[PDB]
Design a protein around this nucleic acid. Structure first.
Lengths: 65, 125
RNA sequence: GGUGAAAUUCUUGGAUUUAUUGAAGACUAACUACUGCGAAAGCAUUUGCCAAGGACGUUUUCAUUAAUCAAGAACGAAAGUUAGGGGAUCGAAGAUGAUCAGAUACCGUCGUAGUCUUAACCAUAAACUAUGCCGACUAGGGAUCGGGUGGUGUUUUUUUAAUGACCCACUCGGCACCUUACGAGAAAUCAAAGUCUUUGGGUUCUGGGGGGAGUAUGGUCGCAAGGCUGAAACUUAAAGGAAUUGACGGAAGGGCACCACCAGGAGUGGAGCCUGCGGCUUAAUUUGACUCAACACGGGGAAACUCACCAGGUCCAGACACAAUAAGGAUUGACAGAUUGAGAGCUCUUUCUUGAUUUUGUGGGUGGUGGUGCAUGGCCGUUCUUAGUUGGUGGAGUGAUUUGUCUGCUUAAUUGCGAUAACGAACGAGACCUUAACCUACUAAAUAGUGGUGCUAGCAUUUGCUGGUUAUCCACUUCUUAGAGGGACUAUCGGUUUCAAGCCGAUGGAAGUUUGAGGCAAUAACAGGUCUGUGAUGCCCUUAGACGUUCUGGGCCGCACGCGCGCUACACUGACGGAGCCAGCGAGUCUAACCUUGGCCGAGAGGUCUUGGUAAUCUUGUGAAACUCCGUCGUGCUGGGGAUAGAGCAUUGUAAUUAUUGCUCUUCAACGAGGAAUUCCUAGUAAGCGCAAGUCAUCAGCUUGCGUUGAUUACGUCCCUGCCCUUUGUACACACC
């Protein structure tokens, strides 16, 4: 779909040999992590921010200034 | 045709696995919370993830869901499994201190074991 | 009766059906089994004779008397060698009736030889366990049949006794079965098909690639069919076994599809026309494409051009290298006449000009809508409106391969819940992107509107209504625009399932089918189309009287006929005349005539003078059409239809004849709802209706989009045609054409 327009690039070249013409097709995708503009990840990629653990009692009190 | 894909289901299971005491049982604040604690590219995908996440706790608070351990279901389980009964099941107190084996078990302990309190039961067809 | 349907046949002489009574015709239905006996073929209700047999029991007896066996014998499924009886159920044949292209067959009705004599088969079967017989060993288990042994076992009755029957254990001998594979095997599989290159227990028979061929000839049994024995010439590179992956099946199971059906709608096929294709014709009627996946397709609506075809006339735009002519001139151009369709110095008569760039020859160069798409690149179409595809590591198998990629449920989905010798992944799907829906929330718009304020018009007059006023001014963004956003995730509730993925119902919501529609889109493939899109291109051809290129005419449109896509109709739900008046997608000209408002002339087509617009500004509110009132028509091929044809007026174009097209008058055909067949379609959908754009100089009955009006019928099924998965058969792999 749309990721083909974003990350996939293509080129077609005709070479001329003795027997005729050979076609060259090159398809390259760059990883979206190195992308500067546009989306930086695949549409179906979901990252979870790791939570920070906490101790249970936390000593009920008040601190003033 | 409302079946969720594995992208929605695996992400929602991963969300509950580490963020149980932050999400509630309604979709409105669940989709609001998923914007910070998760990175989802599209609005349609995060609505589907949060909708299935809320649906999963519609049965998690109903009962334990297999395949999900959400950091709260763990420590009451390794609290529960040290069931040490106050009386044994193999100490002969519900009986009269004597276990009622049959005749074939009596000469078993007579041949090799030491003297113990046994009985004789005429077990037959 | 009888059949898928029917027919032959029997039926007031009473068929079929019912009762009663008799008489001849395999064998013994149920019991009947992974049960018994027998050498095999084979053998099932009884009862009685006649001999026979295995197994078991045995502290009986003989003492090697044995195993397998050329020659030689016995026994035998059935189907006809041959000679009495009894009497057809089935079909050979035969009679008939169907079906069929035929049907001498399958199917129906009847019937002679044909498992009933007593008396032979020569002895043939897929006579099969396609596995010779005798002996030993190697592995576990539960059943079962026959015998035997044991149980301080059950029941039968006299109370237990005797038997019998049953239960538990063991043993011998059988028919077999289940699990593994130490072991074998090419595998399928096998407790033997094991104990086999670590190759020897005993013995009999058979085979040596496929056919020719169980044929010829000889013998023998043979009154018969025919058995038993049994070659060669010649011919051939495979035939064959087991398994794997596909494909196919008039095979099975589970699903799906208006390019399938169902229930319907609108139709097409019938008529006229115009538009492609074929055929015929022609100087040429250029050509490619022929089921889906050729035929309003080549963006192919061709007057010239296009143009590739035909009849003719020019030009080199043949670069460069070499050689030759050649400043006592290499060569080009031309007035007039002839000639020519021609004001082509084409070519000729004449004699001027130009002059070293040219001319000729030798090589090459270039161009080609010339051929080859079966030599190719790229692009597209299709397989394929479906959900499928592949590594890594591990498991199975000698191997091709297989598992993962799956029993079940669910989904639009190999979508998921799950189960699991698999685990972890990748592509496809989904996600994604575009568009149409909601926002009194933001961002502000004289190139979009709204309200008030000024000026001013008409009525009413009472303070009101309908307007106009290019910016008079002020204010706002509801309507319109476009930036960033929000909103739906099946939310809530109820009901169903293994209690999951999900599905259904209701409420709320702008939106509950994946929200509607698209774009994009796997692995593998087709001798699919394109060399006529390309200065994309190999090979072959041509290259100067050219297959180059250009110019004049013509053709592509030619019509005894056949086919496909369509347009207009067969009228009253209508035709015609006035009246109302309602959109959306878009396009539009600087050194060039594009979209054109408005005023005037003309019946119309159209002509003329200006203006606005390089565009949310003007065309344009595109005042579109179907639609709606009022009236005429009156069931009549009529005033439905406008085909065909005649005369004239205009526009574009160098040119309109073979009518370009537009307008006016006249001419007034078929067609009365369309046979067999056949297409498309499930909601703002089909259908009706018109509008913009492409092509354009002129031509739209075509296409790409758009809006107007707006339904009936389903919420299913695999019946027809196809598709996906699993199982299954295969002699198919060019893969059922």
């Amino acid at each position: 779909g749309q990721p083909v327009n974003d990350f996939i690039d293509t080129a077609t070249r005709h070479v001329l040999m003795r027997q005729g013409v050979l076609g060259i097709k090159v398809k390259i995708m760059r990883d979206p992590a190195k992308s500067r503009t546009g989306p930086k990840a695949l549409p179906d990629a979901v990252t979870i921010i790791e939570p920070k653990e906490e101790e249970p009692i936390l000593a009920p009190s008040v601190k003033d200034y | 045709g409302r079946v969720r894909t594995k992208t929605v289901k695996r992400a929602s299971k991963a969300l509950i696995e580490r963020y149980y005491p932050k999400l509630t049982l309604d979709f409105q604040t669940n989709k609001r919370l998923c914007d910070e604690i998760a990175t989802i590219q599209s609005k349609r995908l995060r609505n589907k993830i949060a909708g299935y996440t809320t649906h999963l706790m519609k049965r998690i608070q109903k009962g334990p869901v297999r395949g999900i351990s959400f950091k709260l279901q763990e420590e009451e389980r390794e609290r529960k499994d040290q069931y040490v009964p106050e009386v044994s099941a193999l100490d002969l107190s519900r009986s009269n201190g004597v276990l009622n084996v049959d005749n074939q078990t009596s000469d078993l302990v007579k041949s090799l074991g030491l003297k113990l309190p046994l009985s004789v039961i005429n077990v037959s067809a």
